Design a protein around this ligand. Sequence first.
Ligand SMILES: Nc1ncnc2c1ncn2[C@@H]1O[C@H](COP(=O)(O)OP(=O)(O)O)[C@@H](O)[C@H]1O
Ligand SMILES: [Mg+2]
Length: 602
Amino acid sequence: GSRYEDAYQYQNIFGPLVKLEADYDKKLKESQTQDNITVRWDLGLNKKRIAYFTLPLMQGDEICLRYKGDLAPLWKGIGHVIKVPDNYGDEIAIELRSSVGAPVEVTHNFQVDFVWKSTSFDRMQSALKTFAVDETSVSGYIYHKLLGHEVEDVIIKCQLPKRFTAQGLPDLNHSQVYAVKTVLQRPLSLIQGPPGTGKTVTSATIVYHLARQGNGPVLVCAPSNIAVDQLTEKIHQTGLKVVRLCAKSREAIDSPVSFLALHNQIRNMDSMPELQKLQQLKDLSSADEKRYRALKRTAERELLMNADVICCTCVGAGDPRLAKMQFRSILIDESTQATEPECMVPVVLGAKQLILVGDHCQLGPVVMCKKAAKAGLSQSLFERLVVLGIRPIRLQVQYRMHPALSAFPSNIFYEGSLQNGVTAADRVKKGFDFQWPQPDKPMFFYVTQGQEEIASSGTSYLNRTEAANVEKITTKLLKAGAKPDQIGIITPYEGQRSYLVQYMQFSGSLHTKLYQEVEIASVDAFQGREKDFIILSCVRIGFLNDPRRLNVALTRARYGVIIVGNPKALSKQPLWNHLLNYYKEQKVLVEGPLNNLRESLM
Ligand SMILES: Nc1ncnc2c1ncn2[C@@H]1O[C@H](COP(=O)(O)OP(=O)(O)O)[C@@H](O)[C@H]1O
Ligand SMILES: [Mg+2]
């Protein structure tokens, strides 16, 4: 199978895969350069200059603004993004690191360059090298297991808790008790967590018990900053001392766990007086600067080494500030959303016990370079271990959706093993006068008989008439009660996206402020997320090709899903024909005007 004979071969194969995607990312980013750009200058209340502009991306990313004009400036300046193009406008916004000599005077002939950073790629490469050359990087049993070698099982002989539920978190259910129990006694384990089944509550519980033992700080990571914040919050609810490690650039940002950030916890220490004043002084002196970094370093080191838990994105585990720290226990949440070299960044920090939590029946790792993806980069560590025979313990109680919405996804994607920790009356809105075709089934496939073109732009599709019908659905949910920001429109094409945002503006029944808050995106953007109501626009790639994309799209909703597509055309994909026939049995493949809904017979 996907079995390696040693770590040198393992590096020999994954290392090149990382190089492929690192340069692909580089070239791509360099090709995003645009010229003849109009700017709009401003001044934030911090005195840091902000610059606005539109282009023919993610918060924190660095852009490089160059003025190339006839006048006597000719200036370069780097800043970081603070607003990306969304429902408000196609505009972008950056804040300059040093606004001393910014040409606020001019505003016409600028060039924008997206600054490529090697950091993540360098750390993945370095991680692989460590896995080959440093034998202290993983226990040996872990080494044999990751390489697909057949070694006898091992049981960790820890002190088991009498009660598995942790202080401050919800009461564990049977599948979760089984998972936390089993996992504390195994040097390596996978937990599969279907939508809403308590991946993060469970993870948080496991770290509680691993931190309640006589060993060092638990390392806890995840691929996205969002995923790490959510786990950081839950760990904090259990009374443990947690430290959130932020990337230097992202340090400037406000989350629900901003007080937990290391750089903030340092800006508040009674034990370090001389440090406080120096930070309260650059509001810089050469001799004061050497004392400031020596102290900041001393402080980081204390908070880090005496924390019960260090929370970190996978790539962020390579942080220098975590220099020469080993971590006995490591847990990676949302792990099936990382590439294997990404996960190995934390793993090689001395792992004796590893727990991967994720779901290989939902979306996999994002991989730009197609050639690297097909060669193996798109398979997560979690998935490869499953292929090698490591069976995941499954969390089978879902606390997200109306039992009706869970039926189809559970049956086709989860061997019908799921159970509902919420009932129908737990997920029915109050005073909500939006009448469904079938009262106790908050769902229906609206039969839209609409045409699809290829809007003059490039290679992207859009269903013009389907977009109109989705607007009507959205208008009905809003004037029936539902808040705008609890309505998600999911579609597989960027053409439908752009056409939808602009169609709910040029000619919508209500003002563009209600629709501005309605989030429109592909399934990719919606992973690990939920809304009360989900409208699906299948304009005829995306959630109609990959079985896993359909699973994710059908499990975002809490209170109701409404699919809008052409039944005749979608029947071509096998998965959709089954979906359509099932909606028909439950009597929710409806047709006609929204206000007098009936029942199709196609
Ligand atoms: N065993 C539990 N008892 C009560 N509620 C639970 C339990 N497990 C999960 N939940 C509920 O589900 C939510 C958390 O799910 P979460 O773990 O964040 O989702 P995911 O598995 O996708 O990470 C909470 O809001 C919580 O109320
Ligand atoms: Mg989660």
